[PDB]
Design a protein around this ligand. Sequence first.
Ligand SMILES: [Ca+2]
Ligand SMILES: [Ca+2]
Ligand SMILES: [Ca+2]
Length: 292
Amino acid sequence: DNISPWTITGFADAESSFMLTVSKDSKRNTGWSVRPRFRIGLHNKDVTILKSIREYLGAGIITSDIDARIRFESLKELEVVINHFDKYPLITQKRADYLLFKKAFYLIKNKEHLTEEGLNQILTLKASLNLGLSEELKEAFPNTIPAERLLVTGQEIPDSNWVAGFTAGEGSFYIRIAKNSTLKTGYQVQSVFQITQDTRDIELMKNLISYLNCGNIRIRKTCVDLVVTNLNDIKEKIIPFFNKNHIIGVKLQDYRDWCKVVTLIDNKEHLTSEGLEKIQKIKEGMNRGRSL
DNA sequence: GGTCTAAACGTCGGTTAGGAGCATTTG
DNA sequence: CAAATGCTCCTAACCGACGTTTAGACC
Ligand SMILES: [Ca+2]
Ligand SMILES: [Ca+2]
Ligand SMILES: [Ca+2]
């Protein structure tokens, strides 16, 4: 089965990266090598996801060593990328990065990066891209003025598949077992849906809650979480939503086991010892407890 | 009070993100 | 020759995922 473009975009909002490498090359006229990259790096166990992406865009190089990566570094591949994200725009702060990247791309495509002016401009672009300029690049290009970075605000959810890809990237379906003496079975069993993101896009997360009509915002001791713990919201909103909008990767399997446990909780089997052992058995093989 | 649900509060460790540069091809 | 791209190696935090305690409904 083929993947949705908005799923690709959501997942990219989650896990992808737009990069500019500027490295001193003595074998070049400007004395510098400038190259744009787009990349997605995952755990090996999710190679298939990358393949799916590769199948949709018809571009990208997939490798697998200590991790699995799909990369786009040549001009043509990057054209494919830019086409996709122009048709299907990111909505997190990463979009900003994309724009910078995009600008840089066109400077390199038109070869004016081989000009010192072009080089300097590209350095202003990298200055505001992700982690910005290293100390080495800072001293190599003194007092470069960081390009204006677009603050991504008022981002409406473009598509439900975007949500699917995004939680496929940052989401978490897990079962919480709490040591509670008030429970005659000895433990409280909770089904929990979660999405984690840096505070920079808290607005989006809030706008996401309204989209799912459930969830609470949690601020950590930094990061922000969309947390769904209400069983009825889970059974009536979340589960149907992700049954319609599929989760890719191993997290799909995790989500299935999660679903099974939710059904066990709905039938109040979590209130008995037998059902508790059952649920625990399912949980031990979920997420961090899964194998090859 | 007894019980259970929802969720606020807490915390670990690694899969993500982000990085830089040599090697090879293209020309 | 030089410019583009292929390929490989390095770094660590924003994530994922796990745990306990608190407010409070029904009975
Ligand atoms: Ca992310
Ligand atoms: Ca992930
Ligand atoms: Ca992630």
